[PDB]
Write a protein that binds this ligand. Structure first.
Ligand SMILES: Nc1ncnc2c1ncn2[C@@H]1O[C@@H]2COP(=O)(O)O[C@H]2[C@H]1O
Ligand SMILES: Nc1ncnc2c1ncn2[C@@H]1O[C@@H]2COP(=O)(O)O[C@H]2[C@H]1O
Lengths: 200, 200
DNA sequence: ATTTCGAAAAATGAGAT
DNA sequence: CTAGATCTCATTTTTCGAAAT
DNA sequence: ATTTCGAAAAATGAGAT
DNA sequence: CTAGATCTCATTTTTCGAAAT
């Protein structure tokens, strides 16, 4: 499209190898990122180092957008590379300028912020309203919504570990394992290792 | 300041009494809200009617924006008045106009969004990494800092039910009652009825 | 506005499970 | 194993409308 | 350099508390 | 109550960098 080609123009693209950290919590922020290629995982930790995945951000998604509206803001989370990422970087000071001339670019940003809020909100609900099974069924549907989600005649096909699912719903790897089978025993999903198939 | 009075100048003011419903989750968004005076409660329900309090919004806070970025969108949650409010309402299409005769108004709304995401994200953390005592402990401290709290000789004072408190930390009223008594045993607060004093 | 007075509606705890 | 969830009524606390200050 | 392969590692399955 | 967390061990799957092609 128009504007987005112009934006990237003034961005300083960089490379990040999968599993490398792109953003640190507590970090002072002055940089707005943009994922041109690759995918990351937005995540937070408890005082024990334990970690929860807040979301996954793929291509065309903005990163570290939060510290852009107030002075002295710190990164609210970590943002790790899941695959090899190709991300465009630009300072807050500069980005704010790209808006002056064409506020259509902030409209793209705001729209994405809006969406995240809906999902993060829906997430808080699941957390209080559903049990691990409910939370797991839900997260499975969400994983089938991801771009790196392949296809299967039985439905959609994803690749992820019981370990990782637990960091998403906030339960144990055991609990996930117990429940995963329980779902397979009702032909709703086809589990076999690090691969899950959601019959849909 | 200008940007706002010029904003209101194009809005249609409405008044709602305490406890009335301003937004019904599920309905089609086509309107925007700005709380000129008073305060509201953002909340979600489950099929069984259980209610969860995502947030409290107050004077100067925008409402009903999540739908403003994409076509065919539904209100994400219910919004019910806490106190009597005087709200400014404007259409999406009428707002899309203003944003292009001064995008400074968009920047300002995006700013409130960014903040709600930090906050909602933090809520995700709490639910996962904290025991009910901790979350409740956390809530009182916050509520104690809400614009509608009352100064107290020994601290800040608030009026809220155990019921409601459980709708913010996600747990039953029974548990909020029990934990409440222990926080008093520890001379951390004094709870008489719905009035709770949070010792400075 | 708000302090009062009598319902009527809400919100609680107790302790068993 | 164990934080908490639930379920039940008998009991408080509040809320709400009308009335006066 | 890119591809094939057999340990260490990471991820799980089980069963008791 | 009772959904899930923890712990311990023993087995499977993956991850990966040495070696190979
Ligand atoms: N709930 C969320 N959903 C998606 N992305 C998020 C969420 N919370 C934080 N982030 C991203 O993680 C980044 C962490 O640093 P910033 O606060 O600068 O910007 C944040 C967002 O870009
Ligand atoms: N997590 C949240 N925090 C604060 N406000 C919210 C949250 N989720 C939804 N809202 C508000 O509630 C509104 C529900 O309908 P909309 O989606 O139009 O817009 C939403 C926001 O104005």
């Amino acid at each position: 499209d128009p504007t987005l080609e112009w934006f990237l123009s003034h961005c300083h693209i960089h490379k990040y190898p999968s599993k490398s950290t792109l953003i640190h919590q507590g970090e002072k922020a002055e940089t707005l990122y943009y994922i041109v290629k690759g995918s990351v995982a937005v995540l937070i930790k408890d005082e024990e180092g334990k970690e929860m995945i807040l979301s996954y951000l793929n291509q065309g998604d903005f990163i570290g957008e939060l510290g852009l509206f107030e002075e002295g803001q710190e990164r609210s989370a970590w943002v790790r590379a899941k695959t090899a990422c190709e991300v465009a970087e630009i300072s807050y000071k500069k980005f704010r300028q790209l808006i002056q001339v064409n506020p259509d670019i902030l409209m793209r940003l705001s729209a994405q912020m809006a969406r995240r809020l809906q999902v993060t909100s829906e997430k808080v609900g699941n957390l209080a309203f559903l049990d691990v099974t409910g939370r797991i069924a839900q997260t499975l549907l969400n994983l089938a919504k991801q771009p790196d989600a392949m296809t299967h005649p039985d439905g959609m096909q994803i690749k992820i570990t019981r370990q990782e699912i637990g960091q998403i719903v906030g339960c144990s790897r055991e609990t996930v394992g117990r429940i995963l089978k329980m779902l397979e025993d009702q032909n709703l999903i086809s589990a076999h290792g690090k691969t899950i198939v959601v019959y849909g």
